[PDB]
Amino acid sequence: GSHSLRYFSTAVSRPGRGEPRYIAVEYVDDTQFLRFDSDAAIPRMEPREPWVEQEGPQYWEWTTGYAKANAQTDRVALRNLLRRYNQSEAGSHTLQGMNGCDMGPDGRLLRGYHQHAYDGKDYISLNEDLRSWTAADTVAQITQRFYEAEEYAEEFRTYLEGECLELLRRYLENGKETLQRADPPKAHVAHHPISDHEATLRCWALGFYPAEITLTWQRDGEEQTQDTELVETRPAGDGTFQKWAAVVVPSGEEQRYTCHVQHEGLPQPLILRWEQ
């Protein structure tokens, strides 16, 4: 169905060891198609996916310098932002940033993403109107005034309006065998006896793309949400993910409980029972 195009940024300063570290990546949907690494040899924009390795040289230079300018801007922003609130230069600080757009099946824009954060906080973010931006700390509204002066919300509004649909459409067309796929999970139920007349059930959903998925245990149709245990979605390394959801059951009631899987790659949600 819908798809997304997002670019991150991260910069972490190293005191006394030389210039700050900078790394940034570009994800289309859940898969990163490019990388930029400052401290690695021959720094440039390196394609992370075969389908993007056939692009022309002007595009690769476009992405290399496109990443270089953002790198320097975030670097000096880390510099002058260090001294702004009360810190000696011996500290290691980090800044993060995010942008992108979301396209639907119709080919239009849903909601744009322009957000920036410093050292695990929120700094600035665009609104749903993509004109006024919300700030957080006392440092954030003065750069809010600078972004008001530049009127940047409309310019980046256009770049996320017409252009990122062309980038995302190009990637989806080149990566249709990857970007357009929907991988249904491989799911089963595991039974580990915990004690006498007590056990635990795990619901395993393996190898699914995208990462969005829902696992819900139910006894007799009623959800266990207070009693259920979830873990974060974890990558399998090829782009497929994994998740499990366990519930503690009294032994002998084993059959009352069923796991329910909801995923995009599935025609309809699934129900699973322990096989005995």
Add this chain to the structure above:
Amino acid sequence: DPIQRTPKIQVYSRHPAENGKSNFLNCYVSGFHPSDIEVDLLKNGERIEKVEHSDLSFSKDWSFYLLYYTEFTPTEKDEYACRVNHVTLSQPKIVKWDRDM
């Protein structure tokens, strides 16, 4: 206001572990901050030299996550582990590979 966060550790193979079949071992470290993180993979406790990682990236909460992975062939005698250490974490943490699926 330096904040901090703490890494979340999961040790899992790609495919269901079956003795005598090529499979990668994965240690997925997430939920941590700042960016600098020291994580390791151990075969029977000793350092395994060849490792790779996913490109450094963060989630919607501005928390970094990495994935270290190393090819191997599973066998019942060899125990595997992951060894993580962070600024928040004091004594180096070790978690053992466990048979699940």
Add this chain to the structure above:
Amino acid sequence: ILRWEQ
């Protein structure tokens, strides 16, 4: 071009 701008 440089996008974003800071």
Add this chain to the structure above:
Amino acid sequence: GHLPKPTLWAEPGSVITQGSPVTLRCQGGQETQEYRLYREKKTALWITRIPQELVKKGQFPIPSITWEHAGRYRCYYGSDTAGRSESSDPLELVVTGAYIKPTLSAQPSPVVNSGGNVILQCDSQVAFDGFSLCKEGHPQCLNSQPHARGSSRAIFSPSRRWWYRCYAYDSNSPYEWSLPSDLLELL
């Protein structure tokens, strides 16, 4: 088939650091009763490693300790098809350390009439969920939530003043607590 019940305790204390041996003992039920121990959520593997000679005496020695030993434990006897006792699992076996030192933050002077209820403060720069106050270390400790939503903060005997300890942990791993704080007790 009169229903008995056992009693569980850790020797000594309810709170143990890493590498520190602590014995888990449950008593009956005369001697030698056949005890059985288990851990909730993840199964405790070493329960089979303890010799049944000691298991029938309770007293699970646990030479040294690791972070994996942390969890809830319950002891029952009789198994099935003959008789069984209802198990009691009040104790939570906790391992401390492996995390950052939580910061102690105080209101006015630590020495007052002591009939002022109790008010302390325990902060941390890291973001953790629960904070633990250990007075004695019957009375042992008490668990508490954060005060503010975003930030990690928690606000909280004229003859003999007890000890003082604070800890911090992520709620998803309640039995792994940070390293013992600075000593606000009498010393």
